[PDB]
Amino acid sequence: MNTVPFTSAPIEVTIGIDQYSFNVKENQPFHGIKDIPIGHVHVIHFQHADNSSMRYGYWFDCRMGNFYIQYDPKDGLYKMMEERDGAKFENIVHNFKERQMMVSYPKIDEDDTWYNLTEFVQMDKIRKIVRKDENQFSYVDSSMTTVQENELSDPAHSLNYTVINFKSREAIRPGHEMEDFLDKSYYLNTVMLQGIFKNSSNYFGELQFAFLNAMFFGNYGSSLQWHAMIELICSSATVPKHMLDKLDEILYYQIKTLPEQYSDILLNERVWNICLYSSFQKNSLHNTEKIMENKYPELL
C-alpha cells in the first residue's frame, strides 16, 4: 500500500481519491492519503471551496514513482510532484503516519468498484491521451478540450482521445456508403480495433478513462467521447461476443457509480435510448439495461 503526502492544505478544498471524497478546511493539519491499493491507476482530484470553477486532478500509479502534493500559491492550485529521493520520501511519510495526519483510502474488502471502473485503464495509455512527457502522472481538468473539439485551442493542454466521427471518410468506405453508415462494423472492427487500438482492451481503456474524466472533472469533451465509443459498438451488427459481454459489465459499473444527481449532465438521452432500444445490440446489454431502467427510468 502506497501513500501520497501533502506539504499542507492552505486553502479549503474538497479532495477526491478515486470514487471517495472528503472536505479539508483552510489550514487544517492534513498531510495526505495512505493505504492506496497497489495494482490500479488512481486519480486524486480537487475542487476549491471558495471557487468551484477550480476542478482538476492527477492520474497516477504508485508503482511508477513516489508522488506528493504541495499548494502553489502563485498558480493557485494543489500540484502533484514526483520525489526522486526514496529515503527522504519514506522518512517524511513515516513522520506524518506516526502523527496520524493522513486519511486512509477507505476500500471495503467486498468492494471491487474501482477495479471494475479501471480494469482496462493503464498509465501508459493515459499518458498518450494527456501529453506532458516530463511527468509520470497526468493532469486533467474540467475545461480541457479534446482534439476533436479543437478541430470544430492550445494544443499542448488537450485531451488526445481517438477521433470518432460517423460522417467521415474514415468511417465510410467509398462504395459502401449505406452499408457502412447503417452498420458501423467496418469502422469498429477494421478501422478502430484492428487499425488504431490494436485490441479491445485498449479500446475499453480509453472508454473507461473518458467516463472517469467526465464524472470526476465534469469534462464535456470526455462525455462526448464516452458516448461515441459506446454508440460505435452498439451501432455495429458484428461485434465479438466477448466484447459485448465485457461492455455490459463496464457500463453496468459506470451507471452504478454515477451520482444520481449528476445523471442529467452525464447521460445523453439520445445515445442511451438508441443503444438500449434501437441498435443492433439492443438485446446484448442485459445488466446495463436493467440498472438503467431501475435507476434512471426518466431518461428513457
Binding site: 460522417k167 467521415s168 471518410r169 465510410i172 467509398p174 456508403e177 449505406m178 453508415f181
Partner: protein, 237 residues
C-alpha cells in the same frame, strides 16, 4: 442551413445550386394477392434534380430492376437517390458542379451527406418550403419517358421551356411551382386549363403550351382559382 422564405432570392443568384426531390423514386401500386394478402408492385420512378436558376432538370429514371431482390426499399431509395446525385455531380465539369444541394425532404440529408463526403465544400441543405415537385409525373412528357424506360436512363430537360427569354428566373420558378401545385391539387382540372383550348399547342421540344404573355396571366389566374376552389372544397369554406 435551412432554406425558407426569408432567403428566397438566394435561389436565383449566381451560385449554382440544385434541388433534389426523391418522392417519385420508389413508386408502387398496392394490390391483393390470390390468398387475400396484400402485395406491392413497383413501377418505374425518377429523381427530380433541378437547377432553379436555369431550369435544367436532370431526370434520372429509376427502373424497377434496381429493386429486384432488395429489402427495405423505402430506405434503400433514399440511398440510391443519394448515390445517383453524387454520380451526377462527379460527371459534371468542376465549373458546373453545384455549390449547394437542397433536398425537399429531410430524410435525404444524411444519405446525401454521406455520399458527398468527397465534396466537403458542397453544402447539403434542407428547406422549409413545401415544393410541389412530386407532381412532376403529372407533366405528360416526363411521365411518358419514365414509364417507357426499359433500363436506367438519364434524360435532360429544361423545365422552363423558353420562358427565360421573356421572364426572370424568379418569375419562372413561381410559374412552375404554381403549375405543379395546381396539378398536385387537381390534376384533371389543371390539365383541362392547360390543354382544352384547341388553338394552343405544346412544341415538340417543350413541356408546356406556347402561351403568349397575356395568355400566361390568364392561365396563372385560372390555376390560382383552382387551388383556392380546391381549398374551399377540402375545408368546407
Amino acid at each position: 442551413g435551412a432554406m425558407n422564405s426569408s432567403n428566397y432570392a438566394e435561389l436565383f443568384n449566381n451560385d449554382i445550386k440544385l434541388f433534389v426531390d426523391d418522392t417519385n423514386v420508389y413508386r408502387v401500386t398496392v394490390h391483393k394477392t390470390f390468398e387475400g394478402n396484400v402485395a406491392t408492385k413497383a413501377i418505374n420512378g425518377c429523381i427530380f434534380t433541378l437547377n432553379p436558376k436555369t431550369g435544367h432538370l436532370f431526370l434520372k429514371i429509376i427502373h424497377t430492376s434496381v429493386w429486384a431482390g432488395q429489402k427495405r426499399l423505402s430506405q434503400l431509395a433514399k440511398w440510391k437517390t443519394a448515390e445517383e446525385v453524387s454520380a451526377l455531380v462527379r460527371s459534371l465539369p468542376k465549373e458546373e458542379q453545384p455549390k449547394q444541394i437542397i433536398v425537399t425532404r429531410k430524410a435525404m440529408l444524411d444519405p446525401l451527406e454521406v455520399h458527398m463526403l468527397d465534396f466537403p465544400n458542397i453544402a447539403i441543405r434542407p428547406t422549409e418550403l413545401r415544393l410541389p415537385f412530386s407532381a412532376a409525373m403529372s407533366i405528360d412528357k416526363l411521365s411518358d419517358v419514365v414509364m417507357k424506360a426499359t433500363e436506367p436512363q438519364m434524360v435532360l430537360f429544361n423545365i422552363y421551356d423558353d420562358w427565360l427569354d421573356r421572364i426572370s428566373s424568379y418569375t419562372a420558378f413561381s410559374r412552375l411551382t404554381l403549375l405543379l401545385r395546381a396539378l398536385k391539387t387537381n390534376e384533371e382540372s389543371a390539365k383541362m386549363i392547360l390543354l382544352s383550348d384547341p388553338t394552343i399547342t405544346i412544341k415538340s421540344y417543350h413541356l408546356w403550351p406556347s402561351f403568349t404573355d397575356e395568355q400566361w396571366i390568364t392561365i396563372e389566374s385560372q390555376m390560382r382559382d383552382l387551388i383556392l376552389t380546391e381549398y374551399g372544397r377540402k375545408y368546407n369554406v
